[PDB]
Each structure stands twice: as C-alpha cells, then as structure tokens.
Design a protein around this ligand. Structure first.
Ligand SMILES: [Cl-]
Ligand SMILES: [Cl-]
Ligand SMILES: [Cl-]
Length: 220
C-alpha cells in the first residue's frame, strides 16, 4: 500500500544477503513498524539516488536507506524522528594498547579521503599530535591496519561495528563522536500520516525492546 524505496548496497542499513533478499537494519525496522502500526508496504531497492527521485516524483511514498538528516534535505523532505545517531569512531586491532586519543601522540591513524572521519581527524590533529595517513578506499586502509603500518583507523561507527559483529578482530576503545542523525523521510508536505505512524511505531519498538534486538543483530 505504501511504497518504500531504499538503497541496494549500504550495509548494515540495507544490503543483499546470501539468499539474494534485501535485509539490514532499515529493512527489518520498516517491516516491524508497518506491522506494529497496521499498514502495508511494498519495498523497492532502486538505489539511493533513484529512491530520492521516486519519492520526490510521488511514485514512492517514503525512503529509508541509512539517510542522513541535513538542513539541505529538509527543503524537500520531511523526516521522522532519528532512529540512529551516526558517529565517527576509532578502530584498532584487538591487540592494541590504545585507549584514548592522547595515546595516539606520535602514532599514525588511517582514514578514508572525503569522509566525516577525515574531517574529525584533521580538525583534532594539533590537539593530539598523531600523523594521518589517507586512503582512497577502505580495503587499502584496513590492509594497512592489519600489517601494523598504521596504528589505528577512524571510520563510520555502524560500518566498523557491523564488521566487528561479523567477526573482524577489531575493537573500539573510545566512544564515538556524533556526526549526524539517521531517519525515514517522505516528500515535504506529503504523506504526513506515514511520518506519524513511523514515529509511533519506532517509540513502541523502543519501549518493548524489539528495536534494540534489531540493532544488536547487526551491531553487536
Ligand atoms: Cl524535517
Ligand atoms: Cl562521510
Ligand atoms: Cl589508497
């Protein structure tokens, strides 16, 4: 009944499993909310930009896709309450001694170019006195962490936690720094009852523990 458009490859929020179904925090959450609130949904996964288009054109009713709440997006979208605070966070090998940013003095931290993690590291470099090694892709960065060529990485918390949940022997010794909020969206001025039900469904799932179980599956 309500058409919900999403991305196809944005783990842990939405991704294809081995059975070629789309799963992830977002997929489970919207389904649980629809069931809690008694509406029907059809989920499509045309990709993030295509999902944006479909909602703006009125061919989809809502979008959920690890979507960052920004003032720019508020010009054309109405957002739900945040269901996830996105952080940047430090990652190290299991074996690492590092337990504070102060411990990074003289050490070298890897980061992906063009990211919020890079902004944080660059802005705090004088404060803590680490070197930064910049990478074009995550694979190269984590390869470097593995060989000990860098001492730590800075990355998106849900990405790092998902990888750790999946068995990667990394750890996060320092609490993350908030970079934004994540929410469901409808076209500005459209489908207000869907936002109302999403927020009510979210509150219900938080209150009865079901929300935390979804998060824990992917991030713990
Ligand atoms: Cl809004
Ligand atoms: Cl980023
Ligand atoms: Cl690189």
């Amino acid at each position: 009944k309500y058409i919900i458009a999403s991305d196809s490859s944005f783990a842990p929020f939405v991704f294809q499993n081995s059975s070629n179904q789309y799963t992830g925090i977002d997929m489970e959450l919207i389904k649980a909310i629809a069931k809690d609130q008694g509406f029907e949904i059809e989920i499509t996964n045309p990709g993030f930009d295509a999902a944006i288009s479909a909602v703006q054109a009125g061919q989809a009713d809502g979008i959920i896709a690890g979507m960052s709440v920004t003032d720019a997006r508020k010009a054309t979208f109405d957002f739900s309450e945040s269901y996830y605070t996105a952080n940047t966070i430090l990652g190290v090998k299991e074996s690492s001694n590092i337990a504070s940013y102060e411990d990074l003095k003289g050490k070298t931290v890897g980061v992906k170019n063009g990211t919020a993690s890079q902004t944080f590291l660059t802005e705090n470099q004088s404060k803590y006195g680490y070197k930064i090694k910049t990478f074009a892709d995550g694979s190269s960065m984590y390869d470097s962490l593995n060989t000990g060529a860098i001492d730590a990485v800075m990355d998106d918390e849900p990405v790092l936690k998902y990888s750790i949940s999946q068995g990667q022997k990394l750890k996060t010794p320092i609490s993350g720094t908030p970079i934004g909020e994540t929410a469901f969206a409808v076209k500005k001025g459209a489908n207000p009852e869907l936002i109302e039900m999403f927020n009510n469904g979210l509150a219900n799932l938080k209150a009865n523990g079901e929300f935390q179980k979804i998060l824990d599956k992917y991030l713990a």
